[PDB]
């Protein structure tokens, strides 16, 4: 079946019912610092092309909720990188996209409100939003090094081809 | 007899025909007939390749869903199978025809009526497809001990079935149909191409997809790992397909990629292309076998035989056996923990006579002295009636 | 002709008189229910057989009983080709008797086709429509046989010409 | 399809595939195929001695000796030349094709192999056609038992050649349907006055002819004229005449099939009427 | 409490009752068989009361011959004013299961892909709803071959619909022609004739007028009538030598009570 | 399995058992000879062999009656039938059905005409009584 | 006034005392009881016990008990206890299908005609607490199709397939006593054959005694209607119809009969005591395609109100699954040419 995260740890913290997983990033946010060789963002990107075809997905750990969020976001990125005419430009719009206020668990627009726990209060709200933005910025940054061929001004058709597919038939823009 | 019997295996998308004794069918033609829609207008028709894109004619598929939709059309189809392709004097040859799973006694009489009343054949035997497939597998190097107890996995062009058989007799109430077959895989590959490759002639979209499916596809062991191999060393995985444009006569090339393994993958993850079916084929097989009598359960798991063009994908059998073993092993494990069932031997059989298993099996059977004994004759027909062709000895 | 309608009219009237049936549990076998006109194990339950004939060849035999009626028709067959077309057509229908619930699998001796209409049939189908069907059937098989005869001849001419003109 | 084809499709497709691959340089695949043709004909395609660079095509006819008595070997030699070799045991004629030495126009020899059966029959006709053309009369008639219980008689006369078929209608009702077809042949000149004249007798051998008398035996006579037997028409005439018997039986059967569509449609109409008698 | 353990099903209930309050499949294991019975007065098989005796009790009789056909076996137990006669008693190696199994074979020959193990319960239900005993096989075969009145449709669990016609009477015929299912011996009727004949010569007529049926396998429509016709036939040939005029003196009464399906239970229930 | 070949029902004491001359030739021929058609019909419909066991005597009556029916001229049938009483029409209908059992010289063409008239006068019930008769012509 | 309870046959029916409920057999093993609510019918009960098709149903008015008989050879007396009807098996001792049943007017016994060529007279015994029965056998030679009690609850008319209408004495001294003499005869010991019709053609589908019992009428398959007058030495008047066989008949006055059958419409017959002659009174139901209210054979008819002496309303049910209520007064209103008696 679908690919699940193996990063869940007996000491992994939570923000809502999502896993606040560590990430190797320079962007600001509540994400713990990641020492290990790979993080939830790498995992998400490594499973993307495969997971995106699935329509059903069993939520096993709170880590899966984070993995799912990122998977949905990668799609958002592809929708944008698709029209970029150079790697640098794609990095520009990847920052912009990371900046936009996408809906969060509990709000109208968020595609999986029945699965994700809504922030219990204003602090949790701000932290969660902050963790999501940090995840978006880091994800979008790393995706650019994958989507563009050594010959920039050319987003790989091998990534662009997935632009029309939706993980679990869901969408962060829908 | 001096002349070999005629063997006809009419399939949803392809009809295999030839004479008994031969290892391969003499003709494999599309199961279609082209008609115009008094006098001899009934004879103005074509079948097979010649019937696919006939300008002034309309192509029909009398069996594209498993059963005969039009007996008039089927009857005519046979006229040409006999007098145009096989070139057999029907009165001098016994005929062996095959039937779809759970064919009714009524339909058998309709077929006998055509063969005896229209063509006056001297002998007719309507064979059950699954039994012939099992017999065909006896040719396999994985099987040197012949047995008619096994689980047949027949995947053709429009239909796929998991048929359990016990000592030559199909366990009809345990059969399961799977909404994935050749056409589904082709359509899917076509979509994957629509999202990536440019230049594919609209008129030749399915055609191109079919070729990719038949010439480049295979079954991989893991999706992420395969997608990775491709992204890591595209040079050794992406292929090229240079087709021919008809209404342009110009050349057109495309890269063939992920579709190679994604196509057959839908057997294992139907949800990829089917919104209403999600059961993996390994799970369907396990399910079928678990519904059968306990005493025949192991013999079934140990003899899972493949049949049909859609089972031709490389490593289909291996992938099916592994995933099925996981399911079985996982269960027996969870039962010994929750609580000592001896290990379950699961074996998927792939053999060379797999593309035309049914026809081959039917060919071997109609070329043995025995065949002429179990075959209902024209005599018994005219005296006892058509009802005789219900039981298939 | 003025010979066909008078025939069908007399047949129709007779069918109407005979198709007055009711459910009748077996008097001979414990808890059985069988078409009395077939088993004939109780003489009093059987009505007088009657025949309506249009001429020396075309005729209908009607046999009534308390719960079933057997209707047998001698079909018009002028020559040999009509004789085999009729035999084939009746055979064709007889093989499909189950879908033709009121057809006998075999005709009564001396007839080309027989119907077996029971109380269950007159219970689940308007008996006057069944009467009509029998008369309709009688008229239509003659028409169909005529058409088949013309079809065989039409195609034979074309088949003979196609071959000859190629020399 | 009204007229029956003359060439065998299995022979042609088997050879074509092999010639295609040999021409492309691929290594030859082994080939072993057994099959038939109308009139008790049996064929065998294979690699003699397992040599895959060699493809043999053989035909077996129970009545080959009769054809041999009428120029068969000489004609087959003219047509096939060096492809004709010693006949494989169990067969009367064998053709051998060397996948390593094929002609420029492969498609051409494929076509001739396809007509092996027709070519085995050809000489008997050319023989008597020539007789007629050379005014040589009195010559003895040829007798070909093309089926276990059917016979063809060819006789040359001053201004015409007659081909008489003695066919059997196993199915009793098939005799009736046949008569309807033969009657149309009889009256054929009403559609083509230059066409061959066709005579037909039932249960009684014609005049030319111990001809099997019987209720299921039919005698068809074709009177071929110079315009049909001269060097120009000859081949076409032979292609048609040698397929006549199977042409007649083929149409008798297709005729019954068509009648079946009629019955299916009528029976279906009857069932709609009956179901309309249901209250609901 | 009245508990009647059969070769296949269990009929338990109360006294003065009517019909078992519970009828369930008899599937040390019997200690378990009972923990369930008793968990949310007794009968005994032929050669704690005697089933054949009880059968008669519920009929208000003491003498007579009991024909009990159930799931696993079929017996012919002659009882004499009070208790049975463990010596005359005979057994028939054919009953319910056998008929169900035979019906499966017959449906298989018709062309239906049935399996003896997987579809046993399904076909048993077809048998119970559609099967019956032919009075005159010659007559039944004619109906089957010349008409469609015997054809009934039956919906299998998977939705498919099959047809059952001549096999409706063909399967049960096994009870009269054992050779049909590869069994040596004579049929139930002839078996009944011998039992009574091998008995005395005084109360022999007594037995003949008190033949009572018991068991699920005796529910087949027509069974009683077929038994009678066969006994008149046997008696005629093997006792009257063939005097058709004496046949009238043959008083044959086969008691076939409406609630005979659980005649043993009903009995103990009353005797309780 | 030899004892099953004898039908014991034949000697059953329940086997239901039914309840247990012809016209004047001259009288009829006379009415015929003197053109009194209607009187002829009425005469032939007298003394039906409804009680004899001989098929010949019955066929005798049938021939007599039939002879009269053929004699009539289409346009005279209606009037002659209407002269009959109900028991008369009933009997006539029975003779008409017996007539149908043996087509002679197109005799069925006319019998069908009579049947038409007999039906109009006695209704479908006269046909019912043909089927219901235990004693007939 | 027509009402469709189903498209299949209503095998038989019976009404309670006040005619607020009607019990019908929907051509199967059950009996459905329908109650009138406003101008609608509501199903209120399902009596399910028979393992065969119910062939007869009768409702004893006062004691409010329903008796049914079926092809399963059984008969059940149903008693309403609380809100559900409970069945009590009656051992008929018949080896063939029961075909018809009627409660005697005194409600202390009922008769069941069957295929065993016998009539089962049943009554409740307060000894062993259950129903027992005596058989009337001779000289019945075939299945008894219909039964009808004389007003004295002793004489009983029966129609059978041996083409006969007969009157027997069903006297059961265990629940009643010595019947007063009747014009049919003074000697009425159980089983006594008082009268036998003279005809050997036509199954007798229906029989009926007049309000005072001196007259009995019956309809046969030979499309005739007959009436025997005991005040006239049992002379029988006979009338042959021009239409299809009648299946049911009932007196509506001492000299008027209403019958229905395979023609699907009710008809009228009047008896002229003076001339000892029956006459056709005409079609009562005034108009695929059928001009009749019922679309299939009418097989049962029962007087709803006014008894058989002055019926004002009657009911018919048939194979078409319909139930029609006929108003005698209104029929006369629409058919001015109509004349009863
Ligand atoms: N090598 C191949 N790999 C995958 N699919 C194939 C291959 N060859 C043929 N097919 C597919 O097999 C199917 C036809 O198989 P067949 O057994 O004839 O089915 P059917 O009998 O229903 O017509 C088609 O979908 C065809 O495209
Ligand atoms: N209505 C029926 N007709 C024929 N057979 C029946 C019927 N009902 C049950 N049976 C069969 O009767 C047998 C069960 O009867 P039963 O008396 O309970 O046997 P036992 O007491 O030995 O368990 C089974 O074979 C069952 O299929
Ligand atoms: Ca196939
Ligand atoms: Ca038991």
If you had to describe this structure to a student in words, what would you say it looks like?
The structure holds seven protein chains of seven kinds. With 393 residues, chain B is α+β, with helices and mostly antiparallel strands. Chain B is 37% helix and 19% strand. Chain B has a six-stranded mixed sheet with strand order 3-2-1-7-8-17, sandwiched between helices. In chain B, strands 9, 10, 11, 12, 15 and 16 form a six-stranded mixed sheet that branches. In chain B, strands 5-4-6 form a three-stranded antiparallel sheet. Chain E folds into three domains: 1-50 and 259-272, 2-Layer Sandwich (Nucleotidyltransferase, domain 5), CATH 3.30.420; 51-93 and 184-258, ATPase, nucleotide binding domain (Nucleotidyltransferase, domain 5, 2-Layer Sandwich); 94-183, ATPase, substrate binding domain, subdomain 4 (Actin, Chain A, domain 4). In chain E, strands 6, 7, 8, 9, 12 and 13 form a six-stranded mixed sheet that branches. A three-stranded antiparallel sheet of chain E has the order 1-2-3, with helices on one face. Chain E has a two-stranded parallel sheet with strand order 4-5. In chain E, strand 6 and strand 7 form a beta hairpin. With 341 residues, chain G is mostly beta strands. Chain G has a single domain (1-341), classed as Methylamine Dehydrogenase, Chain H (7 Propeller), CATH 2.130.10. Chain G contains one helix and 28 strands. The A-B interface holds A 1, 3, 46-47, 49-50, 53-56, 157-158, 160-164 and B 192, 195-196, 223-224, 227-228, 230-231, 234, 257-258, 262, 269, 271-272, 275, 278. The structure holds adenosine-5'-diphosphate (ADP) (2 copies) and calcium ion (2 copies). The site of one adenosine-5'-diphosphate has 17 residues of chain E, from helix 3 and helix 4.
Quick gist of this model?
Chain E has helices at residues 29-38, 51-57, 96-110, 120-130, 137-146, 167-170, 188-197, 204-208, 223-239, 263-271, and strands at residues 2-5, 9-13, 22-25, 43-44, 49-50, 64-69, 74-80, 83-84, 90-92, 152-155, 161-164, 211-214, 254-255. Chain E has 272 residues and is an alpha/beta fold.
What is the secondary structure topology, with strand pairs?
The structure holds 7 protein chains of 7 kinds.
Chain B: E1 6-10, E2 14-19, E3 27-30, E4 33-35, E5 46-47, H1 49-52, E6 58-60, H2 71-86, E7 94-99, H3 105-118, E8 123-128, H4 129-137, E9 150-155, E10 160-166, E11 169-170, E12 176-178, H5 182-194, H6 205-216, H7 223-232, E13 239-244, E14 251-256, H8 259-265, H9 281-291, H10 294-301, E15 304-307, H11 316-338, E16 348-349, H12 357-365, H13 371-374, E17 376-377, H14 378-384
Parallel strand pairs in B: 1-7, 7-8, 9-15, 15-16
Antiparallel strand pairs in B: 1-2, 2-3, 4-5, 4-6, 8-17, 9-10, 10-11, 10-12, 13-14
Helix pairs in contact in B: 4-12, 5-6, 5-8, 9-10, 9-11
Chain C: H1 4-18, H2 36-39, E1 50-53, E2 59-64, E3 68-74, H3 80-95, E4 113-118, H4 119-124, H5 127-164
Antiparallel strand pairs in C: 1-2, 2-3, 3-4
Helix pairs in contact in C: 1-5, 3-5
Chain E: E1 2-5, E2 9-13, E3 22-25, H1 29-38, E4 43-44, E5 49-50, H2 51-57, E6 64-69, E7 74-80, E8 83-84, E9 90-92, H3 96-110, H4 120-130, H5 137-146, E10 152-155, E11 161-164, H6 167-170, H7 188-197, H8 204-208, E12 211-214, H9 223-239, E13 254-255, H10 263-271
Parallel strand pairs in E: 4-5, 6-12, 12-13
Antiparallel strand pairs in E: 1-2, 2-3, 6-7, 7-8, 7-9, 10-11
Helix pairs in contact in E: 2-10, 3-4, 7-9
The complex binds adenosine-5'-diphosphate (2 copies) and calcium ion (2 copies).
Residues 11, 156, 308, 358 of chain B line the site of one calcium ion.
Subunit structure (chain G): Component of the Arp2/3 complex composed of ACTR2/ARP2, ACTR3/ARP3, ARPC1B/p41-ARC, ARPC2/p34-ARC, ARPC3/p21-ARC, ARPC4/p20-ARC and ARPC5/p16-ARC.
Subcellular location (chain G): Cytoplasm, Cytoskeleton; Nucleus
Family (chain G): Belongs to the WD repeat ARPC1 family.
């Amino acid at each position: 079946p679908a690919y699940h995260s193996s990063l869940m740890d007996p000491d992994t913290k939570l923000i809502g019912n999502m896993a606040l997983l560590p990430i190797r990033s320079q962007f600001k946010g509540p994400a713990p610092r990641e020492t290990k060789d790979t993080d939830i963002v790498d995992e998400a990107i490594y499973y993307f092309k495969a997971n995106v075809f699935f329509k059903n997905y069993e939520i096993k750990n709170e880590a899966d909720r984070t993995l799912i969020y990122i998977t949905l976001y990668i799609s958002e990125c592809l929708k944008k990188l698709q029209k970029c005419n150079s790697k640098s430009q794609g990095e520009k719009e990847m920052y912009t996209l990371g900046i936009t206020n996408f809906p969060i668990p509990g709000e109208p627009g968020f595609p999986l409100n029945a699965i994700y726990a809504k922030p219990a209060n204003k602090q949790e709200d701000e932290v969660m939003r902050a963790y999501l933005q940090q995840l978006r910025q880091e994800t979008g940054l790393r995706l650019c090094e994958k989507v563009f061929d050594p010959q920039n001004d050319k987003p790989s058709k091998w990534w662009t081809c997935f632009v029309k597919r939706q993980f679990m038939n869901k969408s962060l823009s829908g | 007899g001096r002349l070999p019997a005629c063997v006809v295996d009419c399939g949803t998308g392809y009809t295999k025909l030839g004479y008994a004794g031969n290892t391969e069918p003499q003709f494999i033609i599309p199961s279609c007939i082209a008609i115009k829609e008094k006098g001899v207008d009934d004879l103005d028709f074509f079948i097979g390749d010649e019937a696919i894109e006939k300008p002034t004619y309309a192509t029909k598929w009398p069996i594209r869903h498993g059963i005969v939709e039009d007996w008039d059309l089927m009857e005519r189809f046979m006229e040409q199978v006999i007098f145009k392709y096989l070139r057999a004097e029907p009165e001098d040859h016994y005929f062996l025809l095959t039937e779809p799973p759970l064919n009714t006694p009524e339909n058998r009489e309709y077929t006998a009526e055509i063969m005896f009343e229209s063509f006056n054949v001297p002998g007719l035997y309507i064979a059950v497809q699954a039994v012939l497939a099992l017999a065909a597998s006896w040719t396999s190097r994985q099987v040197g001990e012949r047995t008619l107890t096994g689980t047949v996995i027949d995947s053709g062009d429009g239909v796929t079935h998991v048929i359990p058989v016990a000592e030559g007799y199909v366990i009809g109430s345990c059969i399961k149909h799977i909404p994935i077959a050749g056409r589904d895989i082709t359509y899917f590959i076509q979509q994957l191409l629509r999202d990536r490759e440019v230049g594919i002639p609209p008129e030749q979209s399915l055609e191109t997809a079919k070729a990719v499916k038949e010439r480049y596809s295979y079954v991989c062991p893991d999706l992420v790992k395969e997608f990775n191999k491709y992204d890591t060393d595209g040079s050794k995985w992406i292929k090229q397909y240079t087709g021919i444009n008809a209404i342009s006569k110009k050349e057109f090339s495309i890269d063939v990629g992920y579709e190679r393994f994604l196509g057959p993958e839908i057997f294992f993850h139907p949800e990829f292309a089917n919104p209403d079916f999600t059961q993996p084929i390994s799970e369907v097989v396990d399910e079928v076998i678990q519904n059968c009598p306990i005493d025949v359960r192991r013999p079934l798991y140990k003899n899972i035989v493949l049949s049909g063009g859609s089972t031709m994908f490389r490593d289909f059998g291996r992938r099916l056996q592994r995933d099925l073993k996981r399911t079985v092993d996982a269960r027996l494990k969870l039962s010994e923990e929750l609580s000592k069932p001896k290990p379950i031997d699961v074996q998927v059989i792939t053999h060379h006579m797999q593309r035309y298993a049914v026809w081959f099996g039917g060919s071997m059977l109609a070329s043995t002295p025995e065949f002429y004994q179990v075959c209902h004759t024209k005599k018994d027909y005219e005296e006892i009636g058509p009802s005789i062709c219900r039981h298939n000895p | 002709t003025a010979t066909l309608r008078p025939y069908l009219s007399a047949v129709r009237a007779t069918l109407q008189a005979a198709l007055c049936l009711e459910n009748f549990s077996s008097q001979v076998v414990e808890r059985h229910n069988k078409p009395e006109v077939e088993v004939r194990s109780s003489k009093e339950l059987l009505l007088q057989p009657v025949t309506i004939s249009r001429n020396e060849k075309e005729k209908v035999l009607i046999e009534g009983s308390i719960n079933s009626v057997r209707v047998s028709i001698a079909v018009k067959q002028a020559d040999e080709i009509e004789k085999i077309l009729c035999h084939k057509f009746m055979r064709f229908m007889m093989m499909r008797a189950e879908n033709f619930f009121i057809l006998r699998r075999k005709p009564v001796e001396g007839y080309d086709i027989s119907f077996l209409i029971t109380n269950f049939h007159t219970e689940q189908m308007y008996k006057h429509k069944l009467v009509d069907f029998v008369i309709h059937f009688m008229e239509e098989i003659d028409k169909e046989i005529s058409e088949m005869k013309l079809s065989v001849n039409a195609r034979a001419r074309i088949v003979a010409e196609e071959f000859l003109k190629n020399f | 399809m009204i007229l029956l084809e003359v060439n065998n499709r299995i022979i042609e497709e088997t050879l074509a595939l092999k010639f295609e691959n040999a021409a492309a340089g691929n290594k030859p695949e082994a080939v072993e195929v057994t099959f038939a043709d109308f009139d008790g004909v049996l064929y065998h395609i294979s690699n003699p001695n397992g040599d895959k660079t060699k493809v043999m095509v053989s035909i077996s006819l129970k009545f080959y000796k009769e054809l041999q008595a009428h120029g068969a070997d000489e004609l087959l030699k003219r047509v096939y030349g060096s492809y004709l070799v010693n006949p494989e045991s169990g067969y009367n004629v064998s053709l051998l094709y060397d996948l390593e030495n094929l002609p420029a126009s492969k498609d051409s020899i494929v076509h001739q192999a396809g007509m092996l059966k027709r070519n085995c029959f050809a000489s008997v006709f050319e023989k008597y056609f020539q007789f007629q053309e050379e005014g040589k009369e009195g010559e003895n008639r040829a007798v070909i038992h093309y089926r276990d219980d059917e016979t063809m008689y060819v006789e040359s006369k001053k201004d015409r050649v007659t081909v008489v078929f003695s066919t059997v209608f196993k199915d009793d009702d098939d005799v009736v349907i046949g008569k309807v077809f033969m009657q149309e042949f009889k009256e054929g000149r009403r559609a083509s006055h230059t066409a061959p004249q066709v005579l037909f007798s039932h249960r009684e051998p014609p005049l030319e002819l111990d001809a099997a008398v019987g209720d299921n035996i039919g005698y068809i006579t074709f009177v071929l004229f110079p315009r049909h037997t001269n060097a120009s028409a000859r081949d076409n005439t032979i292609n048609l005449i040698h397929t006549f018997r199977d042409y007649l039986h083929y149409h008798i059967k297709c005729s019954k099939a068509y009648i079946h569509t009629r019955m299916r449609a009528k029976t279906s109409d009857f069932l709609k009427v009956l179901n309309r008698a249901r209250p609901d | 409490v009245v508990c009647d353990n059969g070769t296949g099903f269990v009929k338990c209930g109360y006294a003065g009752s009517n019909f078992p309050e519970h009828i369930f499949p008899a599937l040390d294991d019997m200690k378990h068989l009972w923990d369930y019975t008793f968990g949310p007065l007794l009968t005994e098989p032929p050669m704690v009361a005697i089933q054949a005796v009880l059968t008669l009790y519920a009929q208000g009789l003491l003498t007579g011959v009991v024909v009990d056909s159930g799931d696993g076996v079929t017996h012919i137990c002659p009882v004499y004013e009070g208790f049975s006669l463990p010596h005359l008693t005979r057994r028939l190696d054919i009953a319910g299961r056998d008929i169900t199994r035979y019906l499966i074979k017959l449906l298989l020959l018709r062309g239906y892909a049935f399996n003896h193990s997987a579809d046993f319960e399904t076909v048993r239900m077809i048998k119970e709803k559609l099967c019956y005993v032919g009075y005159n096989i010659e007559q039944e075969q004619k109906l089957a071959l010349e008409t469609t009145v015997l054809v009934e449709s039956y919906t299998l669990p998977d939705g498919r619909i099959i047809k059952v016609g001549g096999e409706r009477f063909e399967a049960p015929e096994a009870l009269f022609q054992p050779h049909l299912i590869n069994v040596e011996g004579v049929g139930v009727a002839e078996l009944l004739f011998n039992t009574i004949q091998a008995a005395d010569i005084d109360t022999r007529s007594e037995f003949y007028k008190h033949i009572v049926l018991s068991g699920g396998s005796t529910m087949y429509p027509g069974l009683p009538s077929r038994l009678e016709r066969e006994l008149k036939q046997l008696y005629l040939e093997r006792v009257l030598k063939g005097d058709v005029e004496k046949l009238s003196k043959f008083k044959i009464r086969i008691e076939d009570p409406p609630r005979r399906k659980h005649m043993v239970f009903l009995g103990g229930a009353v005797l309780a | 399995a030899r004892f099953r070949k004898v039908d014991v029902d034949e000697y059953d004491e329940n086997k239901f058992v039914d309840e247990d001359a012809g016209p004047d030739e001259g009288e009829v021929d006379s009415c015929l000879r003197q053109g009194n058609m209607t009187a002829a019909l009425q005469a032939a419909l007298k003394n039906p062999p409804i009680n004899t066991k001989s098929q010949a005597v019955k066929d005798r009556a049938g021939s007599i009656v039939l002879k009269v029916l053929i004699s009539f001229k289409a346009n005279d049938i209606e009037k002659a039938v209407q002269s009959l009483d109900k028991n008369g029409v009933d009997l006539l209908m029975k003779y008409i059905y017996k007539g149908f059992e043996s087509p002679s010289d197109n005799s069925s063409a006319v019998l069908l005409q009579w049947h038409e008239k007999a039906l109009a006068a006695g209704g479908v019930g006269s046909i019912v009584r043909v089927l219901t008769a235990r004693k007939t012509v | 006034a027509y009402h469709s309870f189903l498209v299949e046959p209503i095998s038989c029916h019976a009404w309670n005392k006040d005619r607020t409920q009607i019990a019908i057999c929907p051509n199967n093993h059950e009996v459905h009881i329908y109650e009138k609510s406003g101008n609608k019918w509501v199903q209120v009960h399902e009596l399910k016990e028979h393992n065969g098709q119910v062939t007869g149903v009768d409702w004893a008015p006062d004691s409010n008990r329903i008796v049914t008989c079926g092809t399963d050879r059984n008969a059940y007396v149903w008693t309403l206890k609380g809100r559900t009807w409970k069945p009590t098996l009656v051992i008929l001792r018949i080896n063939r299908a029961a075909r018809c049943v009627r409660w005697a007017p005194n409600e202390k016994k009922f008769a069941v005609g069957s295929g065993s060529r016998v009539i089962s007279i049943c009554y409740f015994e307060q000894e062993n607490d259950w129903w027992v029965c005596k058989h009337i056998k001779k000289p019945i030679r075939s299945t008894v199709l219909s039964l009808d009690w004389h007003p004295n609850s002793v004489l009983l008319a029966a129609g059978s397939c041996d083409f006969k209408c007969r009157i027997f004495s069903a006297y059961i001294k265990e629940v009643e006593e010595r019947p007063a003499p009747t014009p049919w005869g003074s000697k009425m010991p159980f089983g006594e054959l008082m009268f036998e019709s003279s005809s050997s053609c036509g199954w007798v589908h229906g029989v009926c005694f007049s309000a005072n019992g001196s007259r009995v009428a019956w309809v046969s398959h030979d499309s005739t209607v007959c009436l025997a007058d005991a005040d006239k030495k049992m002379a029988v008047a006979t009338l042959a119809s021009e239409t299809l066989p009648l299946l049911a008949v009932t007196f509506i006055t001492e000299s008027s009969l209403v019958a229905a059958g395979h023609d699907c419409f009710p008809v009228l017959f009047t008896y002229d005591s003076a001339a000892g002659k029956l006459s056709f009174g005409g079609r009562l139901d005034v108009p695929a395609g059928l001009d009749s209210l019922h679309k299939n054979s009418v097989s049962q008819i029962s007087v709803l109100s006014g008894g058989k002496a002055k019926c004002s309303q009657f009911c018919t049910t048939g194979m078409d699954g319909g139930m029609s209520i006929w108003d005698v007064r209104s029929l006369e209103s629409a058919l001015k040419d109509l004349k009863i008696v």
